[PDB]
Amino acid sequence: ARVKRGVIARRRHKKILKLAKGYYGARSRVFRVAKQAVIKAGQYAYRDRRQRKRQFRALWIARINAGARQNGLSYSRLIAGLKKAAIEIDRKVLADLAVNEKAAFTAIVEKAKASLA
Amino acid sequence: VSGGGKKPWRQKGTGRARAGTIRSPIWRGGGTTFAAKPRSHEQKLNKKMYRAALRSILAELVRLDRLVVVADFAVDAPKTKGLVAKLDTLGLKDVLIVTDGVDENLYLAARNLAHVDVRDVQGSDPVSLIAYDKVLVTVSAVKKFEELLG
RNA sequence: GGUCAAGUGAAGAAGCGCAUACGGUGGAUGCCUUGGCAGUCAGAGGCGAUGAAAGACGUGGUAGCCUGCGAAAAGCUUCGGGGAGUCGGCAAACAGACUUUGAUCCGGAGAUCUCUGAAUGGGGGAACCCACCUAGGAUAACCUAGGUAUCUUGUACUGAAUCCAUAGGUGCAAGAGGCGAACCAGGGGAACUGAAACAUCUAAGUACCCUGAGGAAAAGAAAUCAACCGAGAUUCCCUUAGUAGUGGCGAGCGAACGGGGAUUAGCCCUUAAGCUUCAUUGAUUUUAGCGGAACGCUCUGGAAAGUGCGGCCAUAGUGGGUGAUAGCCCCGUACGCGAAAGGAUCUUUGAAGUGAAAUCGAGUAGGACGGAGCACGAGAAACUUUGUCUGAACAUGGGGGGACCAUCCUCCAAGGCUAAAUACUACUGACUGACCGAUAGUGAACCAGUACCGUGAGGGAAAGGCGAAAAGAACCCCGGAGAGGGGAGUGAAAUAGAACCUGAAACCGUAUGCGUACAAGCAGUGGGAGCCUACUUGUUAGGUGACUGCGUACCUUUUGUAUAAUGGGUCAGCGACUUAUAUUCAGUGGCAAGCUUAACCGUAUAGGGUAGGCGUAGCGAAAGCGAGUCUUAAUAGGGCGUU
RNA sequence: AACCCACUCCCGUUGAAAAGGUAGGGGAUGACUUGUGGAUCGGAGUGAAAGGCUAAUCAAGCUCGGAGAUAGCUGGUUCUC
RNA sequence: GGGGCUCAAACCACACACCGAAGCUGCGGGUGUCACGGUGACGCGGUAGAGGAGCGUUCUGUAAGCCUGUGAAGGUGAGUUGAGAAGCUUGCUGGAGGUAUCAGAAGUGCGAAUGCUGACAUGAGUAACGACAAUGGGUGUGAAAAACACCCACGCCGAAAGACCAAGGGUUCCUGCGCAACGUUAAUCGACGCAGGGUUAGUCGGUUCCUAAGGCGAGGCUGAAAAGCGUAGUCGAU
RNA sequence: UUAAAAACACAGCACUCUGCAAACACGAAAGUGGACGUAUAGGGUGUGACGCCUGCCCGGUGCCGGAAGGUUAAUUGAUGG
RNA sequence: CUUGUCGGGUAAGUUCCGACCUGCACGAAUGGCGUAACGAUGGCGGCGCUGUCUCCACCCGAGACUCAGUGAAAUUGAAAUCGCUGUGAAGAUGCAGUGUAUCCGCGGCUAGACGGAAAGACCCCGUGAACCUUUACUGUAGCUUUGCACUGGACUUUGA
RNA sequence: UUGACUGCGAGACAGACACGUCGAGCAGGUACGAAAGUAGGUCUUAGUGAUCCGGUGGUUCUGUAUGGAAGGGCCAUCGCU
Ligand SMILES: [Mg+2]
Ligand SMILES: [Mg+2]
Ligand SMILES: [Mg+2]
Ligand SMILES: [Mg+2]
Ligand SMILES: [Mg+2]
Ligand SMILES: [Mg+2]
Ligand SMILES: [Mg+2]
Ligand SMILES: [Mg+2]
Ligand SMILES: [Mg+2]
Ligand SMILES: [Mg+2]
Ligand SMILES: [Mg+2]
Ligand SMILES: [Mg+2]
Ligand SMILES: [Mg+2]
Ligand SMILES: [Mg+2]
Ligand SMILES: [Mg+2]
Ligand SMILES: [Mg+2]
Ligand SMILES: [Mg+2]
Ligand SMILES: [Mg+2]
Ligand SMILES: [Mg+2]
Ligand SMILES: [Mg+2]
Ligand SMILES: [Mg+2]
Ligand SMILES: [Mg+2]
Ligand SMILES: [Mg+2]
Ligand SMILES: [Mg+2]
Ligand SMILES: [Mg+2]
Ligand SMILES: [Mg+2]
Ligand SMILES: [Mg+2]
Ligand SMILES: [Mg+2]
Ligand SMILES: [Mg+2]
Ligand SMILES: [Mg+2]
Ligand SMILES: [Mg+2]
Ligand SMILES: [Mg+2]
Ligand SMILES: [Mg+2]
Ligand SMILES: [Mg+2]
Ligand SMILES: [Mg+2]
Ligand SMILES: [Mg+2]
Ligand SMILES: [Mg+2]
Ligand SMILES: [Mg+2]
Ligand SMILES: [Mg+2]
Ligand SMILES: [Mg+2]
Ligand SMILES: [Mg+2]
Ligand SMILES: [Mg+2]
Ligand SMILES: [Mg+2]
Ligand SMILES: [Mg+2]
Ligand SMILES: [Mg+2]
Ligand SMILES: [Mg+2]
Ligand SMILES: [Mg+2]
Ligand SMILES: [Mg+2]
Ligand SMILES: [Mg+2]
Ligand SMILES: [Mg+2]
Ligand SMILES: [Mg+2]
Ligand SMILES: [Mg+2]
Ligand SMILES: [Mg+2]
Ligand SMILES: [Mg+2]
Ligand SMILES: [Mg+2]
Ligand SMILES: [Mg+2]
Ligand SMILES: [Mg+2]
Ligand SMILES: [Mg+2]
Ligand SMILES: [Mg+2]
Ligand SMILES: [Mg+2]
Ligand SMILES: [Mg+2]
Ligand SMILES: [Mg+2]
Ligand SMILES: [Mg+2]
Ligand SMILES: [Mg+2]
Ligand SMILES: [Mg+2]
Ligand SMILES: [Mg+2]
Ligand SMILES: [Mg+2]
Ligand SMILES: [Mg+2]
Ligand SMILES: [Mg+2]
Ligand SMILES: [Mg+2]
Ligand SMILES: [Mg+2]
Ligand SMILES: [Mg+2]
Ligand SMILES: [Mg+2]
Ligand SMILES: [Mg+2]
Ligand SMILES: [Mg+2]
Ligand SMILES: [Mg+2]
Ligand SMILES: [Mg+2]
Ligand SMILES: [Mg+2]
Ligand SMILES: [Mg+2]
Ligand SMILES: [Mg+2]
Ligand SMILES: [Mg+2]
Ligand SMILES: [Mg+2]
Ligand SMILES: [Mg+2]
Ligand SMILES: [Mg+2]
Ligand SMILES: [Mg+2]
Ligand SMILES: [Mg+2]
Ligand SMILES: [Mg+2]
Ligand SMILES: [Mg+2]
Ligand SMILES: [Mg+2]
Ligand SMILES: [Mg+2]
Ligand SMILES: [Mg+2]
Ligand SMILES: [Mg+2]
Ligand SMILES: [Mg+2]
Ligand SMILES: [Mg+2]
Ligand SMILES: [Mg+2]
Ligand SMILES: [Mg+2]
Ligand SMILES: [Mg+2]
Ligand SMILES: [Mg+2]
Ligand SMILES: [Mg+2]
Ligand SMILES: [Mg+2]
Ligand SMILES: [Mg+2]
Ligand SMILES: [Mg+2]
Ligand SMILES: [Mg+2]
Ligand SMILES: [Mg+2]
Ligand SMILES: [Mg+2]
Ligand SMILES: [Mg+2]
Ligand SMILES: [Mg+2]
Ligand SMILES: [Mg+2]
Ligand SMILES: [Mg+2]
Ligand SMILES: [Mg+2]
Ligand SMILES: [Mg+2]
Ligand SMILES: [Mg+2]
Ligand SMILES: [Mg+2]
Ligand SMILES: [Mg+2]
Ligand SMILES: [Mg+2]
Ligand SMILES: [Mg+2]
Ligand SMILES: [Mg+2]
Ligand SMILES: [Mg+2]
Ligand SMILES: [Mg+2]
Ligand SMILES: [Mg+2]
Ligand SMILES: [Mg+2]
Ligand SMILES: [Mg+2]
Ligand SMILES: [Mg+2]
Ligand SMILES: [Mg+2]
Ligand SMILES: [Mg+2]
Ligand SMILES: [Mg+2]
Ligand SMILES: [Mg+2]
Ligand SMILES: [Mg+2]
Ligand SMILES: [Mg+2]
Ligand SMILES: [Mg+2]
Ligand SMILES: [Mg+2]
Ligand SMILES: [Mg+2]
Ligand SMILES: [Mg+2]
Ligand SMILES: [Mg+2]
Ligand SMILES: [Mg+2]
Ligand SMILES: [Mg+2]
Ligand SMILES: [Mg+2]
Ligand SMILES: [Mg+2]
Ligand SMILES: [Mg+2]
Ligand SMILES: [Mg+2]
Ligand SMILES: [Mg+2]
Ligand SMILES: [Mg+2]
Ligand SMILES: [Mg+2]
Ligand SMILES: [Mg+2]
Ligand SMILES: [Mg+2]
Ligand SMILES: [Mg+2]
Ligand SMILES: [Mg+2]
Ligand SMILES: [Mg+2]
Ligand SMILES: [Mg+2]
Ligand SMILES: [Mg+2]
Ligand SMILES: [Mg+2]
Ligand SMILES: [Mg+2]
Ligand SMILES: [Mg+2]
Ligand SMILES: [Mg+2]
Ligand SMILES: [Mg+2]
Ligand SMILES: [Mg+2]
Ligand SMILES: [Mg+2]
Ligand SMILES: [Mg+2]
Ligand SMILES: [Mg+2]
Ligand SMILES: [Mg+2]
Ligand SMILES: [Mg+2]
Ligand SMILES: [Mg+2]
Ligand SMILES: [Mg+2]
Ligand SMILES: [Mg+2]
Ligand SMILES: [Mg+2]
Ligand SMILES: [Mg+2]
Ligand SMILES: [Mg+2]
Ligand SMILES: [Mg+2]
Ligand SMILES: [Mg+2]
Ligand SMILES: [Mg+2]
Ligand SMILES: [Mg+2]
Ligand SMILES: [Mg+2]
Ligand SMILES: [Mg+2]
Ligand SMILES: [Mg+2]
Ligand SMILES: [Mg+2]
Ligand SMILES: [Mg+2]
Ligand SMILES: [Mg+2]
Ligand SMILES: [Mg+2]
Ligand SMILES: [Mg+2]
Ligand SMILES: [Mg+2]
Ligand SMILES: [Mg+2]
Ligand SMILES: [Mg+2]
Ligand SMILES: [Mg+2]
Ligand SMILES: [Mg+2]
Ligand SMILES: [Mg+2]
Ligand SMILES: [Mg+2]
Ligand SMILES: [Mg+2]
Ligand SMILES: [Mg+2]
Ligand SMILES: [Mg+2]
Ligand SMILES: [Mg+2]
Ligand SMILES: [Mg+2]
Ligand SMILES: [Mg+2]
Ligand SMILES: [Mg+2]
Ligand SMILES: [Mg+2]
Ligand SMILES: [Mg+2]
Ligand SMILES: [Mg+2]
Ligand SMILES: [Mg+2]
Ligand SMILES: [Mg+2]
Ligand SMILES: [Mg+2]
Ligand SMILES: [Mg+2]
Ligand SMILES: [Mg+2]
Ligand SMILES: [Mg+2]
Ligand SMILES: [Mg+2]
Ligand SMILES: [Mg+2]
Ligand SMILES: [Mg+2]
Ligand SMILES: [Mg+2]
Ligand SMILES: [Mg+2]
Ligand SMILES: [Mg+2]
Ligand SMILES: [Mg+2]
Ligand SMILES: [Mg+2]
Ligand SMILES: [Mg+2]
Ligand SMILES: [Mg+2]
Ligand SMILES: [Mg+2]
Ligand SMILES: [Mg+2]
Ligand SMILES: [Mg+2]
Ligand SMILES: [Mg+2]
Ligand SMILES: [Mg+2]
Ligand SMILES: [Mg+2]
Ligand SMILES: [Mg+2]
Ligand SMILES: [Mg+2]
Ligand SMILES: [Mg+2]
Ligand SMILES: [Mg+2]
Ligand SMILES: [Mg+2]
Ligand SMILES: [Mg+2]
Ligand SMILES: [Mg+2]
Ligand SMILES: [Mg+2]
Ligand SMILES: [Mg+2]
Ligand SMILES: [Mg+2]
Ligand SMILES: [Mg+2]
Ligand SMILES: [Mg+2]
Ligand SMILES: [Mg+2]
Ligand SMILES: [Mg+2]
Ligand SMILES: [Mg+2]
Ligand SMILES: [Mg+2]
Ligand SMILES: [Mg+2]
Ligand SMILES: [Mg+2]
Ligand SMILES: [Mg+2]
Ligand SMILES: [Mg+2]
Ligand SMILES: [Mg+2]
Ligand SMILES: [Mg+2]
Ligand SMILES: [Mg+2]
Ligand SMILES: [Mg+2]
Ligand SMILES: [Mg+2]
Ligand SMILES: [Mg+2]
Ligand SMILES: [Mg+2]
Ligand SMILES: [Mg+2]
Ligand SMILES: [Mg+2]
Ligand SMILES: [Mg+2]
Asked: How many CA atoms lie within 13 Å of B55's alpha carbon, on the beta-carbon side?
């Protein structure tokens, strides 16, 4: 029983070369270079699911700082004031109100201020 | 493999990978690494393990109603159509016929019949008893299984 | 609306990137096969001086090569078969013919059979040169047919030193010589390697070289083993047993007795079985052939063997191929018949020969020295054999029973012949394969031991596929009376067009969409505007990716590599833990104080065969004793073992 | 001078050439040079001796066998959880 | 680390707030072990290495089955399903084969070995085009002329770069017809392709006659065998 | 085929061996060379035209001569156990 | 030691020539000391001559350069392939910080890519290999001693 | 005066193995001491070398047809800078 490798080997190389679509030069058309490019792309994607959550908290916090100082308060003093009174609203929701619903953000900043913080 | 007695090139200095023979298994026309030789595939089965499987098969054939017992089964003159009519009375098409001794006439018929085999008590193996849809046995052959199989 | 100023900044790509669509190159993959590989069952096991194996040259209606033949040259004569086409293939055309008054074709027996080659009349650089003798025929400068090597054996004649007769010399007959894959019996005989170095030892009496024989060979009928009971020639298989031994007692080597089988057989020197060669008596096979059953309609289709419906044959039903898948279309198959003439085998009965050595074994048995062989390496070392040197007895005698002696037992050496069971396959036929399928399988599917390489010995490739059928593209146009194309035709299909099935990847292009000329690095990824396309007209799908956060390839080797340490230009194909025999442990089964057979028979995967192996008892170095035993003066102690 | 040789420079070094070329150099009646044919070879030959030469190969030629020598050493070793 | 920093954005004390990991919590999934009868509990980084469970390829049985010209294998896109190796369904191409399920058997899975064979890239349209005797016009032919033929001039060799024997080669010789490949460019030309033709001996050279070095060598002598040496003899030119 | 030399050879010199079937060399051997030679010859070794010369040591290791004594092989086999 | 010391030659002489003797470590056929002629032999010094040089300039041919035709090679993981100062398998185009900088050719030069080429030849290791030496070990061809055989007769000396 | 004894040995310490170290108690025979008792060398820790092979003294073993013997086993002991 002699087994020939032609059909199975070709099917396996085409799966890798389809994931390497859009890469530059030999990274999208030769198997040896495209195999390493696909592995490193998956290494980056695993790490950047952690970094996506970090990059978005930093963006919300920076926008909350800009909106609070327009009402006479810094970010660190507003967070302490919110925790003092009641509020559990996310940084994600807070950054949305700072840009879109500016009259609601002012009310929250004014209530956090009234907690003497 | 023929040829390949000498080194293709000297060991050092040519800038090529080391070679000792052109008939290497890594080369195009070279030999097979673990080439085969004619060997035997034949296991040992205990005499009693063989009989225990026959008892197990025959017991299951009765439970599944795939065994038909008749009082003697003989035909006169070798004619395939003579046997086909006889088997049609019992309503069997794919059948194994077991008798205490294979008659010449019954062997000459059923030789060209497609899904019919005529065997003997000592000639019927575990595979044939499972392969066919029905087994036809005579009372004289049933007595013969009891002596052989206890 | 005008001028001025400040701000802002679309489009415009020499060329590149990604995506998609079409091509090109290239030849993978799939499917296929006139070629290989390994077996089983048979055959017959040699050819050659009556000229072999192997060749050169020639031979055809027309050039070459392959096949066949040999100046009578793809053939001549006879028998036997058949039953209409034929003049071999690559490889086609044009011609000339052959014939039911029997061709081509197949088988048996004949005839012819150049030159070289053991090559054989003498030479020689193989395929060439030069001769002599006899018989017959021509008259010119020869023709035809036979002879002429060497050695051995036998025979006839002849005859040196030398009288005799010896060596020698001529003539007749008979034989040999050379080739061949293996098997067999002999002569000569390594090393690498292992011993984790290496001398003894091993590898191994292997590889290799040489010489003889045969279809087999060799060996074979006890001066053999056993053990006080017996067996009964030789050969081969399975066990005894990796035991007793042997061994720098290292690495290693390794029996026999006794059992189970295959085969069956002995006969002579007061002259036999047997074997050869003739002549006869019958039978059987081989070399060629002959007969050999049973199907129609319908649908799709270029074409049915496929769909649907109904039948028939069977000692013939998973054969091959026919326009796609056929028991009933063809060739076949089961089953029946067959041979003018050769071959072979077995069978009667007649002859000739051989066996054959004459008369029971003397330079023999035994011994001393040096070696070889026995599983046994000098060892307590028996036995066989012999290079050197010696050397008996005569059946009230001689050999052996592992130093040697005694007693018993058992054989009769120095003379022969003998089948079967056993080994091997270069070669021929049939059948088979959980073998390969064109980088595989033979090096070799194809004009391969070729092309090519080397002075030579020698080494040694690449290279398969149109289509069912050549129906292989008449004719027109561009072009050099080209190459190559555009039409037209053939075809089911020419993007099946001869470099012809399918036609992947690397690699190279054309077209369209988006991006790219102030911007620094493993080229990706998290986020993300804009533009283009499609339709569900935007919580959608596809293509691009301005800008921005992070981010120094893979393998190996290492304490540690982005490492400026190793490896890789890329693609496609191939490429590395197997098999046999002995074992131990685990899982899963069958039997169970028992379990299981090996060779071998076989009604052949059944059944038989229980010789043997393991278990049911241990202790001791052993004799031995035994649920005990060893140590010891010791039923004390202790070691090992026992429910 | 021819002929045999090979002292120097340069060029060439992927060469016109796997040892050459141009310009100079030595011997040139002799222990000379050369054609044809022949003899000696692998632990062997030959050597006015360099371990030189024996078919571009020499501190032991080439070829085929033992033979898949051996390699405590480098390299490589192929799907998934 | 840079910009920049002086009642600091330095240093010494004290205080309160915030940011900040794949740590912890929240929400949704998957798995290992143990206990109970699907729940509870705590685990789930990993090289050498040990243990467990699987995917896919070829062949054999199941299979005289089932699928298939209303289109098999293969190739090329799209969609979809699993934790993965992978599976499934379809458009186009292709034109005749494939193998469900569960078992059995392996030439069973490549990116590396300065791996082997074939094809194709980069260098790059870059180096080079082989003695630095040397060429310029006219005419003809032809699809096309720097190179072919002829003519008029110019250069080079001439103890050769001219003639002739031998060795070696083997048709390269001459003539018609050609230009794909060969010729380091083109070619109408050629030592290239096709087809014809061409070599005439008593005196030339061999053969025949003779021998040298040397070879072979009837008998012979020697040697485990193969064989060595050699006499008569007979080969061997230079 | 990176070394042409001071390296090798050389004429001359000396030592030593060899009486001819020579010493010596190639050959399991037959035989062949030396040599169809014969000590003014042949082999080996060193030195190296020519001139003047070549000194001391015989303890070591070689070679040559001696044969009294000591040691000493195969072989033989008294004696003892 | 050492470029010993003295003399000569030069403006200046580790080389050269002539001496001295303290010969690390000359020496008499592995010859000692001389020697005319000879040498593509080693060292030193003069005359002539000069692009050897100060210090290069111009000119002539063959390449290089451009156009037409034909058309290689080693190399190569993939490249969107800058400087500096640090860091770091310890000497960075690729990492950190920072500075510069529109995109692409052609003619030149070689500072780097630890540039290409050849599994370092130096060095060490392997219970590796060859070949060479000898008073290493164990053997052996050859040469030589003696016993027996081929191999006999007689006489004499002499031991038992 | 010979306890520098003979057969053992509960139990330990050390320790990859092969080796090593300590030892109450029992049985035989002893020596000292009136006796309880002490004694299996020396105040302790170095003074050493495996297996193979060969030799010597014993021996309820074996002993290749049988009775012996040779040879082997067991116990004691000898031969390694
Ligand atoms: Mg394969
Ligand atoms: Mg992209
Ligand atoms: Mg963050
Ligand atoms: Mg965060
Ligand atoms: Mg062959
Ligand atoms: Mg070879
Ligand atoms: Mg190689
Ligand atoms: Mg090889
Ligand atoms: Mg090899
Ligand atoms: Mg091949
Ligand atoms: Mg092969
Ligand atoms: Mg192969
Ligand atoms: Mg059985
Ligand atoms: Mg049947
Ligand atoms: Mg472009
Ligand atoms: Mg593009
Ligand atoms: Mg593109
Ligand atoms: Mg036969
Ligand atoms: Mg014959
Ligand atoms: Mg011919
Ligand atoms: Mg011919
Ligand atoms: Mg012919
Ligand atoms: Mg022929
Ligand atoms: Mg004739
Ligand atoms: Mg006829
Ligand atoms: Mg002849
Ligand atoms: Mg002849
Ligand atoms: Mg004759
Ligand atoms: Mg002749
Ligand atoms: Mg005579
Ligand atoms: Mg013969
Ligand atoms: Mg043969
Ligand atoms: Mg022999
Ligand atoms: Mg033999
Ligand atoms: Mg022998
Ligand atoms: Mg050896
Ligand atoms: Mg060894
Ligand atoms: Mg070893
Ligand atoms: Mg060694
Ligand atoms: Mg040894
Ligand atoms: Mg030795
Ligand atoms: Mg041996
Ligand atoms: Mg032999
Ligand atoms: Mg024969
Ligand atoms: Mg015979
Ligand atoms: Mg024969
Ligand atoms: Mg015969
Ligand atoms: Mg036979
Ligand atoms: Mg015989
Ligand atoms: Mg015989
Ligand atoms: Mg008796
Ligand atoms: Mg008998
Ligand atoms: Mg040993
Ligand atoms: Mg036996
Ligand atoms: Mg027996
Ligand atoms: Mg026939
Ligand atoms: Mg017929
Ligand atoms: Mg028929
Ligand atoms: Mg028939
Ligand atoms: Mg068929
Ligand atoms: Mg078809
Ligand atoms: Mg059919
Ligand atoms: Mg029909
Ligand atoms: Mg007798
Ligand atoms: Mg004797
Ligand atoms: Mg002897
Ligand atoms: Mg012996
Ligand atoms: Mg021994
Ligand atoms: Mg005896
Ligand atoms: Mg004798
Ligand atoms: Mg005897
Ligand atoms: Mg007797
Ligand atoms: Mg005895
Ligand atoms: Mg015996
Ligand atoms: Mg006899
Ligand atoms: Mg045999
Ligand atoms: Mg046979
Ligand atoms: Mg193919
Ligand atoms: Mg092939
Ligand atoms: Mg091949
Ligand atoms: Mg050649
Ligand atoms: Mg040739
Ligand atoms: Mg048509
Ligand atoms: Mg197509
Ligand atoms: Mg087609
Ligand atoms: Mg087809
Ligand atoms: Mg095609
Ligand atoms: Mg492609
Ligand atoms: Mg482009
Ligand atoms: Mg821009
Ligand atoms: Mg700027
Ligand atoms: Mg850049
Ligand atoms: Mg995104
Ligand atoms: Mg989008
Ligand atoms: Mg992005
Ligand atoms: Mg980015
Ligand atoms: Mg980075
Ligand atoms: Mg970064
Ligand atoms: Mg690597
Ligand atoms: Mg390292
Ligand atoms: Mg290191
Ligand atoms: Mg370290
Ligand atoms: Mg790092
Ligand atoms: Mg790297
Ligand atoms: Mg780098
Ligand atoms: Mg390196
Ligand atoms: Mg690197
Ligand atoms: Mg390294
Ligand atoms: Mg590399
Ligand atoms: Mg292969
Ligand atoms: Mg078990
Ligand atoms: Mg069990
Ligand atoms: Mg006890
Ligand atoms: Mg116990
Ligand atoms: Mg010379
Ligand atoms: Mg010059
Ligand atoms: Mg010259
Ligand atoms: Mg001359
Ligand atoms: Mg002269
Ligand atoms: Mg002269
Ligand atoms: Mg001269
Ligand atoms: Mg001459
Ligand atoms: Mg010659
Ligand atoms: Mg020769
Ligand atoms: Mg040699
Ligand atoms: Mg030599
Ligand atoms: Mg020499
Ligand atoms: Mg030599
Ligand atoms: Mg030397
Ligand atoms: Mg050669
Ligand atoms: Mg050479
Ligand atoms: Mg050698
Ligand atoms: Mg071997
Ligand atoms: Mg070999
Ligand atoms: Mg090898
Ligand atoms: Mg190695
Ligand atoms: Mg090591
Ligand atoms: Mg390495
Ligand atoms: Mg390697
Ligand atoms: Mg920073
Ligand atoms: Mg303050
Ligand atoms: Mg905090
Ligand atoms: Mg977090
Ligand atoms: Mg966690
Ligand atoms: Mg949860
Ligand atoms: Mg964890
Ligand atoms: Mg884990
Ligand atoms: Mg199947
Ligand atoms: Mg279709
Ligand atoms: Mg398939
Ligand atoms: Mg398809
Ligand atoms: Mg088919
Ligand atoms: Mg299947
Ligand atoms: Mg394979
Ligand atoms: Mg293979
Ligand atoms: Mg394999
Ligand atoms: Mg494989
Ligand atoms: Mg790999
Ligand atoms: Mg690959
Ligand atoms: Mg890998
Ligand atoms: Mg390379
Ligand atoms: Mg390799
Ligand atoms: Mg590779
Ligand atoms: Mg390759
Ligand atoms: Mg290019
Ligand atoms: Mg360039
Ligand atoms: Mg250039
Ligand atoms: Mg150029
Ligand atoms: Mg040139
Ligand atoms: Mg002109
Ligand atoms: Mg010209
Ligand atoms: Mg002249
Ligand atoms: Mg001329
Ligand atoms: Mg001329
Ligand atoms: Mg000629
Ligand atoms: Mg030629
Ligand atoms: Mg011609
Ligand atoms: Mg011509
Ligand atoms: Mg012409
Ligand atoms: Mg043209
Ligand atoms: Mg050409
Ligand atoms: Mg051309
Ligand atoms: Mg040229
Ligand atoms: Mg021509
Ligand atoms: Mg002669
Ligand atoms: Mg001769
Ligand atoms: Mg003769
Ligand atoms: Mg002659
Ligand atoms: Mg002549
Ligand atoms: Mg030289
Ligand atoms: Mg010279
Ligand atoms: Mg030179
Ligand atoms: Mg010299
Ligand atoms: Mg001589
Ligand atoms: Mg003399
Ligand atoms: Mg001499
Ligand atoms: Mg001298
Ligand atoms: Mg001299
Ligand atoms: Mg000299
Ligand atoms: Mg001198
Ligand atoms: Mg002396
Ligand atoms: Mg003296
Ligand atoms: Mg003397
Ligand atoms: Mg000095
Ligand atoms: Mg001085
Ligand atoms: Mg001075
Ligand atoms: Mg000077
Ligand atoms: Mg001077
Ligand atoms: Mg001086
Ligand atoms: Mg001094
Ligand atoms: Mg001196
Ligand atoms: Mg002297
Ligand atoms: Mg001296
Ligand atoms: Mg002097
Ligand atoms: Mg001279
Ligand atoms: Mg000279
Ligand atoms: Mg001079
Ligand atoms: Mg000067
Ligand atoms: Mg100038
Ligand atoms: Mg110029
Ligand atoms: Mg151009
Ligand atoms: Mg150009
Ligand atoms: Mg830097
Ligand atoms: Mg740095
Ligand atoms: Mg930098
Ligand atoms: Mg980077
Ligand atoms: Mg950086
Ligand atoms: Mg970083
Ligand atoms: Mg440039
Ligand atoms: Mg340059
Ligand atoms: Mg550079
Ligand atoms: Mg460098
Ligand atoms: Mg380098
Ligand atoms: Mg290597
Ligand atoms: Mg190395
Ligand atoms: Mg050592
Ligand atoms: Mg070692
Ligand atoms: Mg030596
Ligand atoms: Mg020695
Ligand atoms: Mg000797
Ligand atoms: Mg003698
Ligand atoms: Mg004492
Ligand atoms: Mg005590
Ligand atoms: Mg006591
Ligand atoms: Mg007392
Ligand atoms: Mg030893
Ligand atoms: Mg006895
Ligand atoms: Mg004894």
From this structure: 11
Resolution in A: 2.6
DSSP β-ladder status, B95-99 and B67-70: unpaired
CA angle (B120 as vertex; B116, B126 as ends), nearest 5: 80
B56 CB closer than 7 A to any strand G atom: no
State the method.
cryo-EM
Judge if the beta carbon of B6 is closer than 7 A to nucleic acid strand D.
yes
Contact, B123 vs B148, CB < 8 A? no
Nearest nucleotide, CA B34 to C1': C578
Q: Which amino acid is at A80?
A: A
CA B117 to CA B13: how far, in whole Å? 73
Are the C-beta atoms of residues A91 and A57 closer than 8 Å to each other? yes
Q: Provide DSSP, A19-77.
A: HTTT--GGGGT-HHHHHHHHHHHHHHHHHHHHHHHHHHHHHHHHHHHHHHHTTT--HHH
CA of B24 to C1' of C600 (A): 45
Q: Answer yes or no: is B5 CB < 7 A from strand D.
A: yes
The answer to whether the CB of A9 falls within 8 A of the CB of A28 is no
